[PDB]
Amino acid sequence: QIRSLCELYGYWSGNGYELLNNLWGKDTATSGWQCTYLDGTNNGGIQWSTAWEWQGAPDNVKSYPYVGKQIQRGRKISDINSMRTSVSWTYDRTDIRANVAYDVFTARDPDHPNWGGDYELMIWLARYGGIYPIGTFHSQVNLAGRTWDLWTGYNGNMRVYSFLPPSGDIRDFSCDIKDFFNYLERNHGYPAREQNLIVYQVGTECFTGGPARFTCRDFRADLW
Numbered sequence: 473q474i475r476s477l478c479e480l481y482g483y484w485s486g487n488g489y490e491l492l493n494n495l496w497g498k499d500t501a502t503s504g505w506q507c508t509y510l511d512g513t514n515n516g517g518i519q520w521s522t523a524w525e526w527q528g529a530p531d532n533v534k535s536y537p538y539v540g541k542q543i544q545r546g547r548k549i550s551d552i553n554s555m556r557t558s559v560s561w562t563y564d565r566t567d568i569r570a571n572v573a574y575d576v577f578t579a580r581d582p583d584h585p586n587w588g589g590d591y592e593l594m595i596w597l598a599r600y601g602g603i604y605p606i607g608t609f610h611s612q613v614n615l616a617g618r619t620w621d622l623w624t625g626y627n628g629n630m631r632v633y634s635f636l637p638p639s640g641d642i643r644d645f646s647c648d649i650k651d652f653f654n655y656l657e658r659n660h661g662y663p664a665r666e667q668n669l670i671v672y673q674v675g676t677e678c679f680t681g682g683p684a685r686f687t688c689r690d691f692r693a694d695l696w
């Protein structure tokens with residue numbers, strides 16, 4: 473690895489991307505740790521991985537190490553035409569409580585901190601160990617060439633929309649996240665004309681299990 477980010481909130485940025493050893497829930501663990509590795513920045517993308525083991529509090533996320541596309545504040549979702557992204561990943565085992573997911577926060581306050589927002593949009597590519605997203609099942613949705621189970625609910629005052637695979641995982645994925653926002657704007661009254669983009673990320677939410685290793689073989693993201 474080019475960089476090993478094993479400290480709490482160990483951080484790298486470059487090429488308009490960033491990487492964080494984002495162990496935001498680790499104090500709920502009874503044992504374990506996690507490191508995030510920058511493996512490469514080849515071909516306009518990022519190659520990275522994370523290794524971990526956690527015990528305790530099986531409904532509590534311990535971490536969400538992520539790669540993020542850096543974005544400028546003050547861009548309304550309605551004024552973003554496209555958020556094209558692809559990811560290729562593997563997990564070395566699936567007998568763990570964890571997901572793989574895109575995470576996007578938006579907020580009416582363009583200076584809202586990066587830990588949250590008014591709204592959260594997640595696109596889950598894996599659902600291991602019997603975990604649930606925030607909220608309850610809403611409806612099925614056709615986007616990005618797939619069918620999704622949409623779940624909705626609240627994390628504090630933040631409304632969370634999570635799009636889940638009905639079965640299996642999706643280890644190679646590409647999409648335009650604006651398709652997901654446009655669907656929410658049409659059918660859920662999502663106020664895209666007053667919501668600003670805060671973060672644009674992919675990573676893995678880790679609850680319990682391991683030793684486990686997530687490998688992001690390639691990540692690319694753009695927006696226009």
Ligand SMILES: OC[C@H]1O[C@@H](O[C@H]2[C@H](O)[C@@H](O)[C@H](O)O[C@@H]2CO)[C@H](O)[C@@H](O)[C@@H]1O
Nearest residue numbers: 530531532533602603604605606627677
């Ligand atoms: O806490 C935020 C985190 O929640 C995760 O869902 C939890 C949920 O908080 C809890 O109420 C329920 O009983 O357990 C689930 C896990 O199975 C959610 O999966 C994450 O996306 C979210 O970041």
